[PDB]
Amino acid sequence: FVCNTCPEKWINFQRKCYYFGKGTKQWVHARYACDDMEGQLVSIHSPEEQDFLTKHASHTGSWIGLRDLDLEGEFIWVDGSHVDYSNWAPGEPNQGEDCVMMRGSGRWNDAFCDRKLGAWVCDRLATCTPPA
């Protein structure tokens, strides 16, 4: 009936859980690190979710789960969803910079995928209160 339960070290927002990771990672590195924790690099689909992420975002930049896929020819989230909501920094995005990071402001920019960032965000679904 109510789905806000999250694992230790994760934080709940709405029906999801979020992990604010710290450590030096390239984009595909953060992707696999989230997968190792049974999550995914975060996907962002509303201003309310973004505002939550901004409150907890690292000041020096974080990888998020968005990258430009060559065959589809567009930015696609790690879970296969399309970009409906976006929070690009003004002028962004602008060949080579295929991966997407989130600044301390919450705003996004594209970047070389081998850039090393000190933070990254995973998400997963929250679990739910049981039957009595």
Residue numbers in the entry: 158 to 251, 255 to 292
Paper text:
Immunoglobulin E (IgE) is a central regulatory and triggering molecule of allergic immune responses. IgE’s interaction with CD23 modulates both IgE production and functional activities.CD23 is a noncanonical immunoglobulin receptor, unrelated to receptors of other antibody isotypes. The calcium‐binding site classically required for carbohydrate binding in C‐type lectins is absent in human CD23 but is present in the murine molecule.
To determine whether the absence of this calcium‐binding site affects the structure and function of human CD23, CD23 mutant proteins with increasingly “murine‐like” sequences were generated. Restoration of the calcium‐binding site was confirmed by NMR spectroscopy, and structures of mutant human CD23 proteins were determined by X‐ray crystallography, although no electron density for calcium was observed. This study offers insights into the evolutionary differences between murine and human CD23 and some of the functional differences between CD23 in different species.
